[PDB]
Amino acid sequence: LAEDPENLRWFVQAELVNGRWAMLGVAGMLLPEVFTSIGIINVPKWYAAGKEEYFASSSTLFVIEFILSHYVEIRRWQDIKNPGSVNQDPIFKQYSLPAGEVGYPGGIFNPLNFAPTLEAKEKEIANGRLMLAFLGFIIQHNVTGKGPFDNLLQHISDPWHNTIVQ
Amino acid sequence: SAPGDFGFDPLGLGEVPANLERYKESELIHCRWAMLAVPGILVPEALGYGQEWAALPGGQATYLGNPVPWGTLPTILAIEFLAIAFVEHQRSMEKDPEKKKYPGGAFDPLGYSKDPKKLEELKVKEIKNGRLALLAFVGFCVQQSAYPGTGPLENLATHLADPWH
Amino acid sequence: PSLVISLSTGLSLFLGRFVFFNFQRENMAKQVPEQNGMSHFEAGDTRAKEYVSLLKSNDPVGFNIVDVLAWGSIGHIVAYYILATASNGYDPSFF
């Protein structure tokens, strides 16, 4: 007998998790542009600490890392079904405990709210999308090239290039 | 994740609430036997000098008459599984509240039957140590359960090694 | 290499757990109950079973193994014989 727009919690979240990890995603780039120098795929190995002991390996620099993340990630699941995270800023966003205009079922279109301080994650909405779709762009044009813009000598007009494989 | 929140009474609770893990108090003390065996290493710089039965050279006392089958293995073995039938025989003749025979009726009023015959009895700390042993026995005990040939000879680098294997 | 008599030792471990009750109470076969002639009727059918009767010699005749299985197996079966050997007898240690 259930009709239309339901979901409640759901993937309103997903967006604000994608964009905030798309924002902090392009923060991966950023660096190699004003003073260009080091970039592309890099296989970075990140930034690297001191010159004492390491040499290419010293074991997996991430698998040991992500066990920690784990039981600090299922904690949003330790949240999304039954709300709980003192700050309370994604599940519905802040302002304390409001947005129950969608927490107890019955959305339909609901835009929402949040931040005792002035406005909202609202013009921190756009900045969510532009970054989720920017990656789109960012890892779209690798497969062919890796640098952005110069001036009017012989770059910003596109001369001759190789196309896709075939 | 087997104790991923589930269980009711006989197969759920009943079998387990202490019982199976109180019989897994054996697991810990058998592991106490196994870690009353292995700690021949544990403390480095020790003074072992040498018996202890190693690598099969002859046996207990050679025996004035050919060894029973052959080896030091079946001599200590074949007995074990009939002499320690002492304990569990007594463990499978129990019951929780009072003991008489198979009398009249004692299913439930208030007081509620009892609790695992030998329940927690409090000390909800043996279990908090029990599962720890189990996790240890099951867990990184495969630090020495995959390719365990060499002993300890640490040379300096870091840790771990992945796969590879 | 093989303990061959490791396990025939082993199997009449258990069927002497057989030598049991031809002896001890009353007759054969807890006397033919039901065998020939044919059960009540019974009928669905039918009985009995009893999770409750795996005792009686669990403890006593769990020795039966070590009988033959000791001194009468790897240790040269009854050396204490003589008792009419001349159409022949012996018998003689293949061991």
Ligand SMILES: CCCCCCCCCCCCO[C@H]1O[C@H](CO)[C@@H](O[C@H]2O[C@H](CO)[C@@H](O)[C@H](O)[C@H]2O)[C@H](O)[C@H]1O
């Ligand atoms: C959530 C459960 C699943 C949904 C599927 C089931 C849908 C429910 C079916 C409706 C049951 C019968 O309802 C029935 O009564 C109406 C009024 O009493 C009648 O309706 C009629 O009478 C009215 C009188 O002014 C007119 O204005 C209406 O236009 C005309 O349709 C119809 O005969 C029918 O609509």
